Chains A and B, each alone.
Chain A
């Protein structure tokens, strides 16, 4: 009759139909994903279309029940998941423009090709060919070419699309009674319990930049050690006290440093853990891998698999001809159906990925008794944090030695621990400042603190300041370097990896304390521990039906985010790196760049300064370079694109340097450019109508 006597009937009607429509949509999506063909890509637009229409129709009807005058937490929180619409408050033209923009950025990122400066008939996509060069190549010039060919043939295409995307997303999020698109991304980590003591959207930024200040010494020591080991290779290219160049970090964006492990390996004589050969030699297959993962999950007390997991979900490459994209993922189809789609091999990393995906399944199996709107992780960090923390215990060489893969004669000295911890820190510690800096840049761009004419300037300023990474060549406002990454061009939240790492190590410390582990945290196995399984399973079942702070309190005995478990995990590595970085410099200065020593400072003493005068200056510099090299019997066609401008203060001064055409690594020496300017000093400022005192050329 009244409110709270009809909203539960509305949610009873919603759940018992949303379950069926979501199951049909998930069945169609699985049938496409394992059987990519023409007739299977057509069936999401006949099932997901009805699911989206039903979701928006029930979201419109949910607004008739106010969030006031309802007291019980689950139905009120289900109405909170509803009411907030799946139908944006945005114009039809603006919504169509936003969809076109997102499709354009996805197409440009997916089909962007970078060609070599000499013989331009071969070009490389990002995933075939450029990621290979970013991962495996130790050549400076090839890495710089692949780093600058990207973000200039692709990022320059993504700059105005990203500007209009930012405008349209801010307009869309302001219609959801938020302030920013970054604030709308922070609709997660938003709880209310009693007396206004809940977790706010603004509390997340304070928590993350407190955690970032708490990880500063460990990351600084890791950065100093990586910089020291990046001087054995690349001599005369990395400053001992400066920042690291952006193209020497193991991939395209410097996200993960784990490809720098062969260059920065400690004790290279000691072999690392690799059970792949014993995995093949014992006749293992995919079924054995997943049965051993299920045996690991049973041993802590978590249940078996649903027996439709073994039948419906594929666990190998399909022998019959069926096109599949082979990306490990775990499927929660709904209605009690759980599946894993991955093309696993007999490999140690495939073993750990199988543990990861089965951890996702076991987290999905727990909250199946919750209502459909609350069948998710309590925040966007717990789900992947559980996934990664379930694979930490089995990667240790005591769980591997129990299964028989590792020989009992393997030496577990204190050097292999340092090798494992440094590989982990390259994977884990080296990606936290990057994640924090990228999400801070996106939050300040959406908030409006970074103007549209200072996107790249602020981006590289806080990349130098926070990450400790310097650009190898200057990028003006025509570039868009964040958009060159997948998660930025495809409109994905990115702080979930930061919170994933924090919650993963917090859960690891809690479960290892519960399981009565004695030694260090990195050598901990939570296997054969029923007590850890009980405390684990009482958190997976809650789903979102409870605030994330109070379900974090029930497992780690702290409502807030803590990084103390993470610093205790890498404590032997931290005290080893303190000893290693004793005669070296720990920290960086944001003044050094690879073009810093060969750049000429120019000061302006006033006729006016538009962007049409910068082009004139660059043309005059290029013509002076051509004239100076013409008298040296070296005909080189210097252009505007070969003159780079850095430290651009549009009122007083800027820096510039000249690069040889067809070779971005070939910076012209500073004496050559100064000699060119002195030779052609008349017609480098006769067009500007100013004497040599106005442009002093320091």
Chain B
């Protein structure tokens, strides 16, 4: 009858990569999709022969990254997005889905942000939305007109003429426990 997996792929807007949200929570819509995906990398389980090991909970983390930043949403990866914005575990299972949205997310006058600077790397599934200024030595400078203090949240600066690699990509990450089963969804 009903299987909630939509309303996350046809949403009118996605947040920035540093402000990703999840869903609590039908897999034939991945192949015959409204938008043809550019990245279909699935780790752990396979896309073909998928609905045989049933899962009791599915999380869908959705955000927007740069075109060259789609590579960094994968297990065991090093980058700005992996270290400071969005981290996946080394034993992550599930599929990573992405598609180009230069006609949608780059037309408006809105802005998309990413955390370039942070004090140390981030844990998997950790959200960091702080606007506190980053000092190279430490502490809080609270003054941009100084030395060693920079704004952490940098802007993608999306323009419809940037070309592939700097274009907006809407990334939706499906993650499963593969071992948690309180007998809820199967």
Contacts and interface: CB of A to CB of B under 8 A. Distances in A.
Contacts of B157: 19-20, 23, 335
Contacts of A5: 136
Contacts of B159: 23, 27, 335
Interface stretch (A306-314, A347-355, A574-582): A306-314
Interface residues of B, number: 19
Interface in B127-167: 136-137, 147-148, 150-151, 154-155, 157, 159, 161-166
For the complex of A and B, list the 8 residue pairs with the smallest distance between their C-beta atoms, beginning with the closest: A336-B163, A13-B150, A308-B163, A20-B157, A6-B136, A336-B166, A306-B163, A336-B165
B62 interface: no
Nearest to A6: B136
Contact of B162 (A13, A16, A337): A337
Nearest to B134: A9
Given A306-B164, A335-B166, A9 B136 contact: yes
Interface of B: 67, 116-117, 136-137, 147-148, 150-151, 154-155, 157, 159, 161-166
Interface in A1-39: 1, 5-6, 9-10, 12-13, 16-17, 19-20, 23, 27
A13 B157 CA distance: 15
Contacts of B155: 20
Nearest to B146: A61
A336 B150 contact: no
Interface in A322-337: 333, 335-337
A336 B162 contact: yes
Contacts of A308: 161-163
Given A308-B161, A312-B161, A9 B117 contact: yes
Contact of B150 (A9, A64, A335): A9
Nearest to A8: B136
8 contacts: A6-B137, A17-B154, A64-B147, A306-B164, A312-B161, A335-B159, A335-B166, A337-B163
Contacts of B117: 9, 12-13
A337 B116 contact: no
A10 B150 CA distance: 8
Interface residues of A, number: 24
Nearest to B148: A6
Interface of A: 1, 5-6, 9-10, 12-13, 16-17, 19-20, 23, 27, 61, 64, 306-308, 312, 333, 335-338
Given A6-B136, A12-B116, A307 B164 contact: yes
Contact of A13 (B116, B137, B161): B116
B110 to A, nearest CB: 15
A544 to B, nearest CB: 21
Contacts of A1: 136-137
A306 B157 CA distance: 19
A337 B157 CA distance: 13
Contact of A337 (B67, B136, B161): B161
Contacts, number: 55
Nearest to A339: B161
A23 B117 CA distance: 22
A16 B151 CA distance: 11
Given A1-B137, A12-B116, A64-B147, A336 B164 contact: yes
A66 to B, nearest CB: 14
Contacts of B151: 13
Nearest to A30: B161
Q: Output the residue of A16, A307, A308 with the most chain B CB within 10 A.
A: A16
Contacts of A338: 163
A695 B165 CA distance: 81
A367 to B, nearest CB: 14
Nearest to A13: B150
A594 to B, nearest CB: 57
Contacts of A306: 163-164
A53 to B, nearest CB: 14
Q: Output the residue of B147, B151, B161, B165 with the most chain A CB within 10 A.
A: B161
A1 B139 CA distance: 12
Nearest to A20: B157
Given A23-B157, A308-B163, 19 more contacts: A6-B137, A6-B148, A10-B148, A10-B150, A12-B116, A12-B117, A13-B150, A16-B116, A16-B154, A17-B154, A20-B157, A335-B162, A335-B163, A335-B166, A336-B67, A336-B165, A337-B161, A337-B162, A338-B163
A261 B105 CA distance: 57
A100 to B, nearest CB: 32
Contacts of B166: 335-336
A29 to B, nearest CB: 14
A314 to B, nearest CB: 13
A361 B157 CA distance: 23
Nearest to B149: A13
A20 B157 CA distance: 7
A684 to B, nearest CB: 75
Contacts of A12: 116-117
Given A12-B116, A17-B154, A307 B136 contact: no
A312 B147 CA distance: 40
A61 B144 CA distance: 13
A333 B159 CA distance: 12
Nearest to A305: B163
B61 to A, nearest CB: 24
A460 to B, nearest CB: 51
Contacts of A20: 155, 157
Contacts of B116: 12-13, 16
B154 to A, nearest CB: 5
B148 A307 contact: no
Contacts of B165: 336
A13 B136 CA distance: 11
A306 B147 CA distance: 39
Contacts of A10: 136, 148, 150
A307 B162 CA distance: 11
A335 B68 CA distance: 11
A348 to B, nearest CB: 31
Contacts of A23: 157, 159, 162
Nearest to A64: B147
A306 B151 CA distance: 32
Nearest to B102: A308
A560 to B, nearest CB: 37
A133 B147 CA distance: 60
A306 B117 CA distance: 31
B100 to A, nearest CB: 12
